[PDB]
């Protein structure tokens, strides 16, 4: 039994390792994890209680590069080889993807005990929004925060928002250097300049109120830019680095939330709390069901998060709407005729109810969100082992699950000719979304119990979006006015750009320029 002499040579070998020249040591510090990673994958591949794991060369990094550049093309290749459930390594994390409607069910309807959104997202959002809200709090708090925000998102609220949003659009056409319709009949714009600007102007005026919109006409607007630059997927890896980008971000968060808090405290002092905006609403309705009240700081931080999330999804979407219509004068013409019919040649004022009578306009939004889901991947951290039904698979705690309704939006099996933009695929189905059957309430209102729809621009289950009707209201007013006021087209040789999958939303790669011209060159915008 010469295991003793073998154990002596183990200790001897461990000693001889340290006497290697330093280059051989570093070389061994690199070659040994690499070889072990390959060996580990080969062994892992033997497992039958695990989904197939995408092979990768660089330890820790995994498939990060190819996933980040072209996630849908990555998914399609993986789907061909391995089917609908497969894992990949992403910067030290194991991501289990479940494609298609069954994956929507597996992730969006997973048990609260099994998965955690806030554990996946906290580092992404908390340094931008501030503490105590959205993902920096337990799920039950998030549920009620969504309930609070929904209280300012009623039909009656949208009826008041429409003329406010319309006013802001017309003001932008009049005053922005990108347009100046009283002085120019044609111009060239970068839609990733105009649309983020129009989106924050319209959303601040309606959700935040006249005071906070007024602020955007000052140097305070630079704080919003500074905060917007902090809203980036780099926060997943580097939420805080001692650089200037980060300190500009933190400073802006303090100053913007400070501005909101100043208005909040001034309103309470003056007893000036009406039903004007989301701030009024949160001042009157922000008590959790255990009787704890949101602080003024948490109210402000929630306002930041709502406005920032709504900012990126909606600005990206109206950019894509403009870009797809720039090569589709037929759609512009069809939309214009609908406007003339619904609004009696323009003699009728746009109202929230009339927006509902504009199916083609709404189908255009719907179809843009099919082809351009602003969020290509949604994440949950796995908290308890999950059995994948009808498989032998178990997804262990410490893994992440990734769901991608945006991938299914682009599958021919569910949307024939899925890479053609065609608003008429939605004829007699112009609703922003539809609960086909039974409903459930997680704390913010009854929503569809099933999430099997191949079309889920707004997600589903407890984390489902509550801004869908605001987004359609905002996008609808904005596009109604764009269509009635302008025609637009591409400069020669340009077409729809491909998306940027490394940004917070799948926005178009730039510079994405269109040329506009006034339908009525003599139309003037008053005020
Ligand atoms: C076209 C516009 C929009 C799209 C496509 C969209 C999409 C989504 C999606 C897919 C989710 C689910 C996220 C997940 O499961 O991880 C979500 C959540 C949410 N969205 Fe939106 N959104 C849009 C606009 C807005 C707007 C305008 C607001 C606010 C006014 C908003 C506020 C929220 C909130 C509060 C949540 C809940 C997050 C959670 O429960 O974890 N969204 N949105
Ligand atoms: O903002 C994100 N998720 C919060 C969000 O739901 C966004 N949102 C939804 N509705 C409106 N905004 C949210 C909810 C409530 C709020 F109040 C504020 C919010 F903001 C998100 C952003 C980027 C990625 C992402 C993932 C992978 C990726 O690819 C990679 F890794 F870079 F390669 C790129 C981006 C995922 C989620
Ligand atoms: C015969 C004539 C008389 C018939 C009666 C007609 C009643 C008309 C009143 C309709 C009610 C709408 O009036 C009021 O609108 C505001 C929006 O401005 C809604 O307000 C809602 O949105 C605002 C703004 O986001 C939030 O601040 C607020 O917390 C929320 O409740 C009120 O909830 C609603 O009560």
Look up the CATH number of the domain holding residue 167.
Answer: 1.10.630.10
The number of residues making up the chain comes to: 527
Q: Which of 304, 293, 217 is nearest to 254 (CA)?
A: 304
The C-alpha atoms of residue 181 and residue 189 are separated, in whole angstroms, by 13
Residue 35 lies in a domain: no
Q: How many CB atoms lie within 10 A of CB 248?
A: 17
Residue 347 annotated as binding site: no
Residue 271 lies in a domain: yes
Residue 68 beta carbon below 6 angstroms from any ligand 2 atom = yes
Experimental method: X-ray
The C-alpha atoms of residue 428 and residue 236 are separated, in whole angstroms, by 41
Tracing tokens 């580097």 back to the chain, one arrives at 238
Residue 36 lies in a domain: no
Q: At what angle do helices 296-326 and 329-342 cross, to 10 degrees?
A: 120
The C-alpha atoms of residue 243 and residue 234 are separated, in whole angstroms, by 13
Domains in the chain: how many in total? Answer: 1
Find the 277 Cα to ligand 3 centroid distance in Å: 11
Residue 504 lies in a domain: yes
Residue 9 lies in a domain: no
The C-alpha atoms of residue 305 and residue 175 are separated, in whole angstroms, by 28
Residues with Cβ within 6 A of ligand 3? 151-152, 154, 156-157, 160, 275-278, 280-281
**Do 376 and 506 form a contact (C-beta atoms < 8 A)?**
yes
Q: Which of 274, 256, 280, 277 is nearest to 207 (CA)?
A: 277
Q: How many CA atoms lie within 13 A of 375 on its CB side?
A: 20
Q: Which ligand is the nearest neighbour of the Cα of 276?
A: 3
Residue 134 beta carbon below 6 angstroms from any ligand 2 atom = yes
Tracing tokens 């890479």 back to the chain, one arrives at 419
The CA-atom distances, in angstroms, between 167 and each of 293, 470, 526, 527 are 35, 16, 11, 10
For the CA of 471, the closest atom of ligand 1 is 27
DSSP, residue by residue, 289-358: TTSPBPPHHHHHHHHHHHHHHHHHHHHHHHHHHHHHHHT-HHHHHHHHHHHHHHTGGGTSPP-HHHHHT-
**DSSP helix/strand/coil, 131:** coil
The C-alpha atoms of residue 383 and residue 324 are separated, in whole angstroms, by 41
This PDB structure is determined at a resolution in Å of 1.9
Residue 476 lies in a domain: yes
Residue 436 lies in a domain: yes
**DSSP helix/strand/coil, 401:** strand
Q: Which domain holds residue 325?
A: 123-518
Q: How many CA atoms lie within 13 A of 285 on its CB side?
A: 16
Residue 196 lies in a domain: yes
């Amino acid at each position: 039994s010469i295991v003793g002499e073998a154990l002596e040579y183990v200790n001897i070998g461990l000693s001889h390792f340290l006497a290697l020249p330093l280059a051989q040591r570093i070389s061994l510090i690199i070659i040994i994890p690499f070889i072990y990673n390959i060996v580990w994958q080969l062994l892992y591949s033997l497992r039958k209680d695990r989904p197939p794991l995408v092979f990768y060369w660089i330890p820790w990094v995994g498939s990060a590069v190819v996933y980040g550049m072209k996630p849908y093309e990555f998914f399609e290749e993986c789907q061909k080889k391995y089917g609908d459930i497969f894992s990949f390594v992403l910067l030290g994390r194991v991501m289990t993807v479940y494609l298609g409607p069954k994956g929507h069910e597996f992730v969006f309807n997973a048990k609260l005990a099994d998965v955690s959104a806030e554990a996946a997202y906290a580092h992404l959002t908390t340094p931008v929004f501030g503490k105590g809200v959205i993902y920096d709090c337990p799920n039950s708090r998030l549920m009620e925060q969504k309930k609070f925000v929904k209280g300012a998102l009623t039909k009656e609220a949208f009826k008041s928002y429409v003329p406010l949003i319309a006013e802001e659009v017309y003001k932008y056409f009049r005053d922005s250097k990108n347009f100046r319709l009283n002085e120019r009949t044609t111009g060239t714009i970068d839609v990733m300049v105009t649309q983020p600007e129009m989106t924050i102007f319209t959303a601040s005026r309606s959700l935040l109120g006249k005071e906070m919109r007024a602020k955007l006409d000052t140097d305070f607007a630079y704080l919003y830019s500074d905060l917007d630059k902090g809203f980036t997927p780099i926060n997943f890896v580097f939420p805080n680095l001692p650089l200037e980008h980060y300190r500009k971000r933190d400073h802006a968060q303090k100053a913007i939330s400070g501005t909101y808090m100043s208005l909040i405290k001034e309103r309470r002092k003056n007893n000036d709390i009406q039903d004007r905006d989301l701030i009024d609403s949160l001042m009157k309705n922000s008590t959790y069901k255990d009787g704890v009240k949101m602080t003024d700081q948490e109210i402000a931080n929630l306002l930041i998060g709502v406005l920032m999330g709504g900012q990126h999804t909606s600005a990206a979407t109206s950019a894509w709407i403009l870009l797809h219509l720039a090569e589709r004068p037929d759609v512009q013409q069809e939309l214009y005729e609908e406007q003339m019919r619904v609004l009696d040649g323009g003699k009728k004022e746009l109202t929230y109810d009339l927006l509902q009578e504009m199916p083609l306009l709404n189908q255009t939004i719907k179809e843009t969100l099919r082809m351009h889901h602003p969020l290509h991947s949604l994440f949950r951290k796995v908290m308890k082992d999950m059995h994948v039904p009808n498989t032998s698979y178990v997804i262990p705690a410490g893994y992440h699950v990734l769901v991608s309704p945006g991938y299914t939006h682009l599958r021919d099996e569910y949307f024939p000719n899925a890479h053609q933009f065609n608003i008429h695929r939605w004829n007699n189905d112009s609703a922003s979304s539809y609960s086909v059957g039974e409903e459930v309430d997680y704390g913010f209102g009854a929503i569809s119990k099933g999430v099997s729809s191949p079309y889920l621009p707004f997600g589903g289950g407890r984390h489902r979006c509550i801004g869908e009707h605001f987004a359609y209201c905002q996008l609808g007013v904005l596009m109604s006015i764009f269509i009635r006021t302008l025609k637009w087209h591409y400069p020669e040789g340009k077409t729809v750009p491909p998306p940027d999958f490394t940004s917070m939303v799948t926005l178009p790669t730039g510079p994405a320029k269109i040329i506009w011209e006034k339908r009525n060159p003599e139309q003037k915008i008053g005020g």
